[PDB]
Amino acid sequence: TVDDILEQVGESGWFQKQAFLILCLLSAAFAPICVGIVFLGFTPDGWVYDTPGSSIVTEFNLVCADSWKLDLFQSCLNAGFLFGSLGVGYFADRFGRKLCLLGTVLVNAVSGVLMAFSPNYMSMLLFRLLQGLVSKGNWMAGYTLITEFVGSGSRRTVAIMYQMAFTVGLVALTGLAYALPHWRWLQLAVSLPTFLFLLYYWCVPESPRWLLSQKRNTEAIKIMDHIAQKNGKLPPADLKMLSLEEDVTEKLSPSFADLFRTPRLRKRTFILMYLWFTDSVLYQGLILHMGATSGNLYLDFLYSALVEIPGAFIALITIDRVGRIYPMAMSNLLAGAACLVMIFISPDLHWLNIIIMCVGRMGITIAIQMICLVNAELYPTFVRNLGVMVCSSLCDIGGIITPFIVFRLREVWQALPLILFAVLGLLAAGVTLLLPETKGVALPETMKDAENLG
Ligand SMILES: CN(C)C(=N)NC(=N)N
């Protein structure tokens, strides 16, 4: 199979390290497509806006349809996510993974370049929809590819280090937003590492599991000897692409074969969609809990962006031995019991508000780090379609429902949204962390996992 030859080969070799840096340079490009609107949505105030830079609000005249503008903008981005979920979930299974990712990166690069010189607001909306759709496809495909590519005992290292790469992408976005004469300079500076990825994407291999599922043993042997020659060692071909006698046709029934696995997979994928929805809603509620500003213009966003590194390092230290479901329970209970304190009286002589908000964030970031890792480890039949469906098709619902509901609630009553978010999160997502599946150090992706699971 793949795990035995991966253990017999260098799982963390130097070629693996340069491929890791290349897909990390992919990972830092996912910051502004999801969170960079805060650096593009400055609203300082015949309408005159006093700011040395500019924004979309300064560019247009958003004084009577300002609420109709940005809400529809982010709703169209999340609709682009909604199309892109099913789109890449079937397209990666159809035309493979690596060529899909390369073409999708090229489309992202040309779409960002054309976004930098957007003529009209209709072009703005269309390009934002296409950008969101493509960028979500790129990031999820890259994360799945490198989760599969690394060996058995080093999945978490890769996953947590790429969440760290996303964090340093937000940090570099905050550092870049200091030099903001127009949004165009920011977008043009962001779009250049995508071309760097395209330039240095000629020396990256495919996914051995998906390639082996195509019964192409020759190119599997080719990529194994390429990996061995890159590390400069003779490969101990114990299996020699044995393929475990796999002959099942790829994409036989994506999400249609779950009827035979109803008592064993339906409840698991349901609780996974529940946990994704809870993470998205709680995350957005904690961002809007101050409305992305608290006495500052950039320091609040840095506090909401540099908080991920302590959570990531805590996860990397913690989840090696205790498992991957107890971290879910600890993170969920900590987030709930941290956000529940804001109902109490504000700190008269201390900083309890920022303390509970930062520890709640830490809990939510530990939860989001894991949700992706356990999703990649699970859905053993085909990790692409089902994994994207649980990842993105129940996060776009959070993106379309969560800001409108909490905005209207904070317009009418502060107490209801925080209480409902805390109750739903704490109770339901702590019940959700009650072993959806048995955890194993190995990472196979065959249907034998679905029918056995140890
Ligand atoms: C990257 N995007 C869109 C997030 N909202 N991240 C998140 N922690 N839910």
Numbering used by the authors: 3 to 47, 124 to 532
Q: What's the publication's text?
A:
The human organic cation transporter 1 (hOCT1), also known as SLC22A1, is integral to hepatic uptake of structurally diversified endogenous and exogenous organic cations, influencing both metabolism and drug pharmacokinetics. hOCT1 has been implicated in the therapeutic dynamics of many drugs, making interactions with hOCT1 a key consideration in novel drug development and drug–drug interactions. As part of the major facilitator superfamily (MFS), hOCT1 operates on an alternating access mechanism, allowing substrate-binding sites to be exposed alternately to either side of the membrane via transporter conformational changes. Each hOCT1 transport cycle involves transitioning from the outward open to the outward occluded, then inward occluded, and finally the inward open states. The protein can be divided into several different regions, with the N-terminal domain (NTD) comprising transmembrane helices 1–6 (TMs 1–6), and the C-terminal domain (CTD), consisting of transmembrane segments 7–12 (TMs 7-12).
In the case of hOCT1-metformin in DDM micelles, we successfully delineated structures in three conformations: outward open (hOCT1-M1), outward occluded (hOCT1-M2), and inward occluded (hOCT1-M3), at resolutions ranging from 3.8 to 4.1 Å. The shift from the outward open to the occluded state is characterized by the movement of the extracellular termini of the CTD helices, with the intracellular portions of these helices exhibiting minimal displacement. This results in channel narrowing, as helices TM9, TM10, TM11, TM12 converge towards the cavity, followed by TM7 approaching the central cavity by moving ~ 1.5 Å. During transition from the outward occluded state to the inward occluded state, both the extracellular and intracellular ends of the CTD helices rearrange significantly.
